[PDB]
């Protein structure tokens, strides 16, 4: 899931690119522990869950 | 297959607008005719 955000040049502000995610075991705890990825305020889902 | 370059078989459609899902895997047809003749296929499918 690295290639959709962590990459060369991001999308245009006006024209945002869409990436489909399917068939994976994505784990978001790594982003939880990553000092870059501190903004994690989930509105209706437990953030560590 | 068409000679030299990539074939023009994709003439069933010419334009694609918007896309949601993609799935690439091994071909659905595992039957082969390379063994010999005198035998035909009995492919059966149900699409539900």
Show which of residues 5-34 on chain B sit within 8 Å of chain A, judged by CB atoms. 20-22
Closest CA to B29 of B40, B13, B44: B44
The Cα–Cα gap between A2 and B22 comes to: 19
Distance between the two ends of chain B, CA-based, in angstroms?
32
The residues, ordered by sequence, that sit 6+ positions from A47 with a Cβ below 8 Å of its Cβ are A32, A40, A41
Query: How determined?
Result: cryo-EM
Query: How close is the nearest chain B Cα to the Cα of A38, in Å?
Result: 30
> CA–CA distance from B17 to each of A3, A7, A47, B20 (Å)?
24, 26, 36, 10
């Amino acid at each position: 899931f690295d290639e959709v955000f962590n990459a060369t040049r991001f999308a245009s502000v006006y024209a945002w690119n869409r990436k489909r995610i399917s068939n994976c075991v994505a784990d978001y705890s790594v982003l939880y522990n990553l000092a870059p990825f501190f903004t994690f305020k989930c509105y209706g889902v437990s953030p560590t869950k | 297959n068409n000679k030299s370059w990539m074939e023009s078989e994709f003439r069933v459609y010419s334009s694609a607008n918007n896309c949601t899902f993609e799935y690439v895997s091994q071909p659905f047809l595992m039957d082969l005719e390379g063994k010999q003749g005198n035998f035909k296929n009995l492919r059966e499918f149900v699409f539900k």
